[PDB]
Design an enzyme around this catalytic site. Structure first.
Site, short mmCIF file in Angstrom:
data_model
loop_
_atom_site.label_atom_id
_atom_site.label_comp_id
_atom_site.label_asym_id
_atom_site.label_seq_id
_atom_site.Cartn_x
_atom_site.Cartn_y
_atom_site.Cartn_z
CB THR C 135 -0.95 0.02 1.22
OG1 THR C 135 -1.87 -1.07 1.13
CG2 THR C 135 -1.72 1.34 1.29
CD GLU C 244 14.63 28.05 7.59
OE1 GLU C 244 15.64 27.55 8.14
OE2 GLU C 244 13.97 28.97 8.11
N1 LIG Z 1 8.79 1.60 12.36
C1 LIG Z 1 7.69 0.91 12.02
N2 LIG Z 1 7.74 0.13 10.94
C2 LIG Z 1 6.67 -0.56 10.56
C3 LIG Z 1 5.45 -0.47 11.33
N3 LIG Z 1 4.57 -1.26 10.74
C4 LIG Z 1 5.17 -1.81 9.68
N4 LIG Z 1 6.42 -1.38 9.59
C5 LIG Z 1 7.39 -1.71 8.57
O1 LIG Z 1 6.80 -1.44 7.32
C6 LIG Z 1 7.11 -2.47 6.40
C7 LIG Z 1 5.84 -3.19 6.00
O2 LIG Z 1 4.91 -2.29 5.43
P1 LIG Z 1 3.47 -2.06 6.01
O3 LIG Z 1 3.25 -0.62 6.25
O4 LIG Z 1 3.22 -3.04 7.09
O5 LIG Z 1 2.66 -2.47 4.70
P2 LIG Z 1 1.38 -1.76 4.12
O6 LIG Z 1 1.73 -0.37 3.77
O7 LIG Z 1 0.21 -1.97 4.99
O8 LIG Z 1 1.17 -2.50 2.74
P3 LIG Z 1 0.43 -3.89 2.49
O9 LIG Z 1 0.20 -4.46 3.82
O10 LIG Z 1 1.44 -4.54 1.70
O11 LIG Z 1 -0.79 -3.52 1.73
C8 LIG Z 1 8.09 -3.37 7.10
O12 LIG Z 1 9.40 -2.93 6.76
C9 LIG Z 1 7.80 -3.16 8.56
O13 LIG Z 1 8.87 -3.39 9.46
C10 LIG Z 1 5.47 0.41 12.50
O14 LIG Z 1 4.48 0.53 13.20
N5 LIG Z 1 6.60 1.04 12.77
MG LIG Z 2 -1.48 -3.20 5.05
#
Ligand SMILES: Nc1nc2c(ncn2[C@@H]2O[C@H](COP(=O)(O)OP(=O)(O)OP(=O)(O)O)[C@@H](O)[C@H]2O)c(=O)[nH]1
Ligand SMILES: [Mg+2]
Ligand SMILES: CC(=O)O[C@H]1C(=O)[C@@]2(C)[C@H]([C@H](OC(=O)c3ccccc3)[C@]3(O)C[C@H](OC(=O)[C@H](O)[C@@H](NC(=O)c4ccccc4)c4ccccc4)C(C)=C1C3(C)C)[C@]1(OC(C)=O)CO[C@@H]1C[C@@H]2O
Ligand SMILES: CC(=O)O[C@H]1C(=O)[C@@]2(C)[C@H]([C@H](OC(=O)c3ccccc3)[C@]3(O)C[C@H](OC(=O)[C@H](O)[C@@H](NC(=O)c4ccccc4)c4ccccc4)C(C)=C1C3(C)C)[C@]1(OC(C)=O)CO[C@@H]1C[C@@H]2O
Ligand SMILES: CC[C@H](/C=C(/C)[C@@H]1C[C@@H](OC)C[C@H](O)C(C)(C)[C@@]2(O)O[C@@H](C[C@@H](OC)[C@H](O)C(=O)O1)C[C@@H](OC)[C@H]2O)CO
Ligand SMILES: CC[C@H](/C=C(/C)[C@@H]1C[C@@H](OC)C[C@H](O)C(C)(C)[C@@]2(O)O[C@@H](C[C@@H](OC)[C@H](O)C(=O)O1)C[C@@H](OC)[C@H]2O)CO
Ligand SMILES: Nc1nc2c(ncn2[C@@H]2O[C@H](COP(=O)(O)OP(=O)(O)OP(=O)(O)O)[C@@H](O)[C@H]2O)c(=O)[nH]1
Ligand SMILES: Nc1nc2c(ncn2[C@@H]2O[C@H](COP(=O)(O)OP(=O)(O)O)[C@@H](O)[C@H]2O)c(=O)[nH]1
Ligand SMILES: Nc1nc2c(ncn2[C@@H]2O[C@H](COP(=O)(O)OP(=O)(O)O)[C@@H](O)[C@H]2O)c(=O)[nH]1
Ligand SMILES: [Mg+2]
Lengths: 426, 427, 427, 426
Positions: C135, C244
């Site tokens: 996403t 900036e």
């Molecule tokens: N720092 C941090 N990283 C996150 C978190 N949730 C997911 N990630 C990271 O984000 C990546 C995964 O993407 P997500 O945001 O979970 O995926 P999404 O955007 O929901 O996309 P889909 O699930 O593929 O539709 C991985 O590298 C995870 O470690 C969070 O709450 N904090």
């Molecule tokens: Mg997702």
């Protein structure tokens, strides 16, 4: 860090092991089911050295029980502290060894050893920094002797940078306890000379002498003998589990006790050893303790140390004591009787001390001697071996399992070389 | 200001350091938790008011430092100043150096750098180790070497636990000590050495105590350290900075070893059967048995002597005492040095801890001595080493981790050279 | 006034946003229900008094946003700011872009427009996504593209979750990230990137925590965000507006990636074993392990650095620190930039939430860095992609929804070009 | 959204299904009649994923039961949770298949399949956004194997953009369980390779090994085996029903697990698997869990994964855990034993996690492996097939229902091609 993995092999090894786990349990305030009921934070500081932790503040021996002979281990399991062990750490087969080293080392033992290795590997992963392996076995049996040696070989191969120490129950040369004992002992010794860093040599004859002559006791059982062994064992590792002034360690002891790589066969002792009845007749001065430690009658190997020179000696004290008193005592001992310590090594002794006496005693001590006199023990075994082997007596039982004559000869040769080396430093 | 850092390394070193810190807390009014003027030489000034020392605490043994971390003098220390690893060398020079130490050493260096970053005039270091113990000999040597690269102009003083001739602890000391000597030599400036046998003797005679511990020894050492350092911190008639102990004590740039001795070391009992005048104290300082090593100083010419008087001290009296000492025929001195004595007189007296046997004294002294008489001990050590090494005792352990045997030979050669130099000096 | 909107997209983005909002609520005195001066930059002024944020909350995953909608920080949010759909891309770039996202995107745009309609000087955006997640990479790219058409002059800053070299989560990241890079590049202005491995390392060393969660990470990210933004909202000595960070950080109009790092990130325990002075903080900022990505910055010249000091800060000290940094030989800088550092000093300090491990500090900093040292990571990513793509791993999924394979090639070419540019810059 | 339609086919499929519906019921707080008695709103948030709602807060499995063989489904109906199913969702015929794929796929099954399709269509209309279809069947029977394949074909034709996943019970190649089993399995595999997006391959031999070697159990019943399967099934879809940190999904798993379209045959596992008796001997660390997950003896397909490379692996955790611990563990695993993961795919693993442990456990995990080693399974089946078909043994039973020799040959060819493809990535 400083974590130790324990292996017990064969009948003797298992029995001693049970006692050892009782004693360690007591020391660390662990009750027979595995709950902690201590009153000192000192008790748990380094509990990890022997015990793994589980859910519900449960403590489990980092301990593996091996026997090709089944039923001995069933007794252990049935026993009081049997319930502390992990069921998955019982490795056993469905056939005895008939006191046959070849069956333990080559054939029957080879079929079981994989399992043991797997368990050992698993155990190793729960060490922050593995100190080494501690084995309890007997020479003269088939499983402890043959399979023990086999297992040791494997483990050294996989963890050559961790310390390999064995508490090995050897024969009583004046009254031997099986018929093929000499064969087994000789075969094992070969393996141990090459594949361990230290071997504590305990003999039942000496134990009985201790019980009778020193402790003024009678009707002593195998239980009592195990107790004595267990006390020495616990003493050996005290400095890994607890605080102190000068703290020992396994390799530290090896560093001070093994001046040539193959000369790593120790005579362990404990002090004080006096009667239970005549308690008040004596008291706990450091000099008295040292006297008890150093006297031949109080050692647990089958030598007169007075028939040889000490290459090196390690004394490990427990209790709060005057270091002055300790050092001075040692010095006096060396000065008075310099002939009994080899003159080519200035300061043959070593001291270590831990601020924490075990249960009853205010002052206790463990003795570890490396004397040229131990040649006697090996010499007698080789004599025994030769008398039989020159007539190929009992040999068919071993050749039948694929062992070759040449191997026996080579083992004898190595034993003789060991003796020769010991004589060199005498 | 004259503001500096300490290093306490290995079990023994750590123990000594504890005592030292306790003494400092007593002296500067600091409570074990950091609460209370010129303290700040060691205790780098702090955020919320609670003072925190500048000491490097290192042990590859976890246990001793773990004990410290659950002690009374606990929150006083920074978590990082105390360092940990996994396992002892086990009196193995080839582990503090070479194998295992080359791993932690970087961290230690970083810590030291950070500490320095608070100084506005870093006069140098104080290092606590052991000529013998496996960690604090190889590792300490390594550390000193590293420091030499990163701080060329800064003094690096060492407090050293030389093994006594007759008494022993662990029977691979003769190797380790020699190795340390070989690799410390050119990176340290000064190495203040104290035996244990001598201390025990002192306790038996002077303090009237026949059941000593390590704790007592540590306290004694700490006292000496305090005496050495007090001119940095408090006011004085004559102030001896750390950098003076280079220039008033090292007559040649390989001779880096002085004997550190203290007086009066007498308990409350026959203290009141004594005057404790300046002259008497001075006399006590130069007597053979009151020295804190096993030399017969009458067998050896003095090169440089340095005295650090504390408390109610009138310089005239001191001068008189020194003159008297000079007059004596048995207190021998070199052909090439007339101005043999260096004097520091400090308006603050020594301060006594609860439990420490040495009673309250209005005046006290610490003496530092270089002589040909130290060479005897060195010779003995060399002999021991040679006896060990010819039959190749325990050589395979050090060699088996990472060493050449030629190193041993080199060390021996160095020792011989040192001996020769001493002989020349005597001439 | 300097009054702006945020965008939180995908699971990770949404999570980050929650934390951010919590932090904002703490800072500006707002209670989770909207009740309580200069807050209004984000919280567009409201009808009955209860404040409502300006954030775009988007997830094609229902679940995360559903959780938010039944959380504590619940009525705070407008129903519409939070957006929902039906199903994940499932790390599928060809669904956020192209197929499924081209449907919701219009709604998002409308929302953004509406939000803008409240600004009296919309300085720009903050966007939260993931170089990796399906996403928040395709969809976010699409959104950014759309914004580029509808807001040409307005800054669009991005907070980015770059995947660490060694550690991984979902094994189609190398495609997705690259795709995002290809289609984000020309529509965003700045992309503040934070790894997770680096954060974990920091937690283990600096904060003394070895059992972290995502929550902790989110909180840390939020802190950084707050530091970045605080000059919009509160007063200051020197005020760094959103615009900036274009002009003091993008030396060339394709190099849009800075590393966002925070200090002091130390817990209460050995905080009191520390001074926490300005210089020390600055030093910490430029050290390798304290950085929030996996670069060895010593392997790469700095292009532009930007520092955002918060709390009790005297500019003189800052200047001194910067001078010291400049002096250091290891902190390398480009041939073509002398004025390497951009400084913001803000009278309001950072504010600490209940549960957040980082203790109360009178002063703190957030640093933003452009370097050739980021290129290593890019190269690694490229390599990964190439290794994947030659055997045509999982290509049919993206291609099967709506893509050309030539796109992949184009992306790779772009990456190569970027690398070349970096090399040139280094020269 | 994210709604799943469940189909159970044949005897095995129905039996497993019953267990699955029990377990899901328990998880979502549904009692055996269909009333909700939960205490958490988390339980109902996404209850729609498996259950339809009816008047009176009644919850009904979105579940279709198919069998040409009548009576097996009668047992289901008679059972405890049998009363939750919609009577109109029981589709059954009046003739068995005699373990005959041809009768299930071509003739007898074709007569019943219309009804099933009609029901499926009806079910589809009550999805806000249909995630896909989940099937439970067996290869080696006639109905689950033949008719299951038939039904799958139809459903893919009608809903090609929704995900088609099958939990398929395959043969135990070392001890096969019918005579025509190889024929049936081979015929089904052909269909499944082309018409499903993922197939979870479960074999009873592996299950029994798990029960005996790992769980230390004896007297295990088909019920117990079903339990194990059901647990994996539930684990698979947890992220559609509940919250978490990284949330999985069907296509997400497919995206990470299927690097070439035809390689979609998975080996499922569960962890922890230790004895009920020896509970306290172990504890729940993430490392331990991962060890259990990854060890060959704990997998439910009939391969040694060590005899092949992993193309990709998905781990789905349940419980609140350190992501650091998770990722680092994975990294360590990959580094230490990089040879067991194909080197052409950087980061072969995948993690997902859900904040909601099932009933007893604090920490549970489901393993999904795609290894080149699974070639072994297909290879053995093809061997079995060939030995019979080259003599046209048992073939008359199939030709009699209108099947042609050529079809068999083609199926074999496809199977061989699959094997070849797997070998490519080995
Ligand atoms: N720092 C941090 N990283 C996150 C978190 N949730 C997911 N990630 C990271 O984000 C990546 C995964 O993407 P997500 O945001 O979970 O995926 P999404 O955007 O929901 O996309 P889909 O699930 O593929 O539709 C991985 O590298 C995870 O470690 C969070 O709450 N904090
Ligand atoms: Mg997702
Ligand atoms: C009233 C009283 O003080 O009784 C003493 C006692 O009489 C004596 C004789 C004990 C006693 O030991 C024996 O008689 C003995 C029996 C078989 C083999 C060896 C010894 C004692 O049983 C042993 C017991 O030892 C301990 O408690 C230690 O902690 C010891 N524990 C065990 O061996 C142990 C026994 C049963 C269950 C669990 C542990 C220990 C020693 C070293 C390392 C760890 C633990 C003690 C002091 C005593 C009794 C109870 C009479 C002595 O032994 C020990 C090991 O302390 C024997 O000589 C010493 C001197 C003791 O004073
Ligand atoms: C006192 C106590 O803690 O008992 C545990 C227990 O002893 C153990 C051994 C359970 C036990 O499971 C088995 O013995 C077992 C029997 C056949 C096939 C497979 C497993 C247990 O029966 C299973 C039961 O599992 C559950 O409650 C889960 O929620 C599980 N439920 C079911 O399988 C279930 C069983 C009957 C009726 C309805 C549901 C589940 C797992 C995954 C997904 C959804 C649900 C648990 C923890 C236990 C007992 C009761 C002894 C274990 O299994 C599970 C699935 O948890 C076996 O290894 C684990 C570790 C557990 O600690
Ligand atoms: C130093 C190593 C050591 C060497 C010797 C010989 C040591 C020295 C001394 O002990 C430390 C002896 C000791 O001082 C005693 C005289 C009190 C005494 O204990 O000696 C033994 C006999 C002696 O051997 C003759 C003993 O067996 C022994 O081992 O002695 C009888 C005994 O009856 C109560 C008692 O009279 C061997 O390890
Ligand atoms: C990574 C994928 C993976 C590859 C291997 C080989 C993995 C790695 C490790 O587990 C993660 C092994 C593990 O660390 C142990 C040593 C503790 C252990 O579990 O190994 C097994 C034997 C091993 O195979 C030899 C096992 O079957 C297995 O699968 O191992 C005996 C077992 O007795 C208690 C114990 O000793 C296959 O999926
Ligand atoms: N004065 C004094 N000497 C000590 C103390 N602790 C140990 N020693 C002496 O130091 C020497 C032993 O070295 P240790 O410091 O214990 O050894 P270590 O540095 O820990 O090195 P390893 O244990 O070998 O790794 C012996 O000569 C001891 O007498 C102490 O607290 N005070
Ligand atoms: N000290 C001691 N010796 C034992 C014990 N059990 C057996 N032995 C001795 O061990 C030897 C017999 O070997 P054993 O261990 O029983 O045979 P295995 O089971 O084949 O290894 C004999 O010398 C016995 O005296 C015991 O519990 N303690
Ligand atoms: N795991 C499991 N396997 C089963 C069950 N019932 C039957 N089987 C297996 O399924 C195969 C027989 O097929 P079955 O489903 O009974 O025939 P069908 O009704 O014609 O499809 C054999 O391999 C059986 O071991 C069950 O409840 N669980
Ligand atoms: Mg030590």
């Amino acid at each position: 860090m400083r974590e130790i993995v324990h292996i017990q092999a064969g009948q003797c090894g298992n029995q001693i092991g049970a006692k050892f786990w009782e004693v360690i349990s007591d020391e660390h305030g662990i009750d027979p089911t595995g709950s902690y009921h201590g009153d000192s934070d000192l008790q748990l500081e380094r509990i990890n050295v022997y015990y793994n932790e589980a859910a519900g503040n449960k403590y489990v021996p980092r301990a593996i029980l091996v026997d090709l002979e089944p039923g001995t281990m069933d007794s252990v399991r049935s026993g009081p502290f049997g319930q502390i062990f992990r069921p998955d750490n019982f490795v056993f087969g469905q056939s005895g060894a008939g006191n046959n080293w070849a069956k333990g080392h080559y054939t029957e033992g080879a079929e079981l050893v994989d399992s043991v290795l797997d368990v050992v590997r698993k155990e190793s992963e729960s060490c922050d920094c593995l100190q080494g392996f501690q084995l309890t076995h007997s020479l003269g049996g088939g499983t402890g002797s043959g399979m023990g040696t086999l297992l040791i070989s494997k483990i050294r191969e996989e963890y050559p940078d961790r310390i390999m120490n064995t508490f090995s129950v050897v024969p009583s040369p004046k009254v031997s306890d099986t018929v093929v004992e000499p064969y087994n002992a000789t075969l094992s010794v070969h393996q141990l000379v090459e594949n361990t860093d230290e071997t504590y040599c305990i003999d039942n004859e000496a134990l009985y002498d201790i019980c009778f002559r020193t402790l003024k006791l009678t009707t002593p059982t195998y239980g009592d003998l195990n107790h004595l062994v267990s006390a020495t064992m616990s003493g050996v590792t005290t400095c890994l589990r607890f605080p102190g002034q000068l703290n020992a360690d396994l390799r530290k002891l090896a560093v001070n006790m093994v001046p040539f790589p193959r000369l790593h066969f120790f005579m362990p002792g404990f002090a004080p050893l006096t009667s239970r009845g005549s308690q008040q007749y004596r008291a706990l001065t450091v000099p008295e303790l040292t006297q008890q430690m150093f006297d031949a009658k109080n050692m647990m190997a089958a030598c007169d140390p007075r028939h040889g020179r000490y290459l090196t000696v390690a004394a490990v004290f427990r209790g709060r004591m005057s270091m002055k008193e300790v050092d001075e005592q040692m010095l006096n001992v060396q000065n008075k009787n310099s002939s009994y310590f080899v003159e080519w090594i200035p300061n043959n002794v070593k001291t270590a001390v831990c601020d924490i006496p075990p249960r009853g005693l205010k002052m206790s001590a463990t003795f570890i001697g490396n004397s040229t006199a131990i040649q006697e023990l090996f010499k007698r075994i080789s004599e025994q071996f030769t008398a039989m082997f020159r007539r190929k007596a009992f040999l068919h039982w071993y050749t039948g399992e694929g062992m070759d004559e040449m191997e026996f000869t080579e083992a004898e040769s190595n034993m003789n070389d060991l003796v020769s080396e010991y004589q060199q430093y005498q | 200001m004259r503001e500096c850092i300490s290093i306490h390394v290995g079990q023994a070193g750590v123990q000594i350091g504890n005592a030292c810190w306790e003494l400092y807390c007593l002296e500067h009014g600091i409570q074990p938790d950091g609460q209370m003027d010129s303290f700040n030489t060691f205790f780098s000034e702090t955020g919320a008011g609670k003072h925190v020392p500048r000491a490097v605490f290192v042990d590859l043994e976890p246990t001793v430092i773990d004990e410290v971390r659950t002690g009374t003098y606990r929150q006083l220390f920074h978590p990082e100043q105390l360092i940990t690893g996994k396992e002892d060398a086990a009196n193995n020079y080839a582990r503090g150096h070479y194998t295992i130490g080359k791993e932690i050493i970087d961290l230690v260096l970083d810590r030291i750098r950070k500490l320095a970053d608070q100084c506005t005039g870093l006069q140098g270091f104080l290092v606590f180790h052991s000529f013998g113990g496996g960690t604090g000999s190889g590792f300490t040597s390594l550390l000193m070497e590293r420091l030499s690269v990163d701080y060329g102009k800064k003094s690096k003083l060492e407090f050293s636990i030389y093994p006594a001739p007759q008494v022993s602890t662990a029977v691979v000391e003769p190797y380790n000590s020699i190795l340390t000597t070989h690799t410390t030599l050119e990176h340290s400036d000064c190495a203040f050495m104290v035996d244990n046998e001598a201390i025990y003797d002192i306790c038996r005679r002077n303090l009237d105590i026949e059941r000593p511990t390590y704790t007592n020894l540590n306290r004694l050492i700490s006292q000496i350290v305090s005496s050495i350092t007090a001119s940095l911190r408090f006011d004085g008639a004559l102030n001896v900075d750390l950098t003076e102990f280079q220039t008033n004590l090292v007559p040649y740039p390989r001779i880096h070893f002085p004997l550190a001795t203290y007086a009066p070391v007498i308990s409350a009992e026959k203290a009141y059967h004594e005057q404790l005048s300046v002259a008497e104290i001075t006399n006590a300082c130069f007597e053979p048995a009151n020295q804190m090593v096993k030399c017969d100083p009458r067998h050896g010419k003095y090169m440089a002597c340095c005295l650090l008087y504390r408390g109610d001290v009138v310089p005239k009296d001191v001068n008189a005492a020194i003159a008297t000492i000079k007059t004596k025929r048995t207190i021998q001195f070199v052909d090439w040095c007339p101005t043999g004595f260096k004097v520091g007189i400090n308006y603050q007296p020594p301060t006594v801890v609860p439990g420490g046997d040495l009673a309250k004294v209005q005046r006290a002294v610490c003496m530092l001595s270089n002589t040909t008489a130290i060479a005897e001990a060195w010779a003995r050590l060399d002999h021991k080493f040679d006896l060990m090494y010819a039959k190749r005792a325990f050589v395979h352990w050090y060699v088996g981790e990472g060493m050449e045997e030629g190193e041993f030979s080199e060390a021996r050669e160095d020792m011989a050279a040192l001996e020769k130099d001493y002989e020349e000096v005597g001439v």
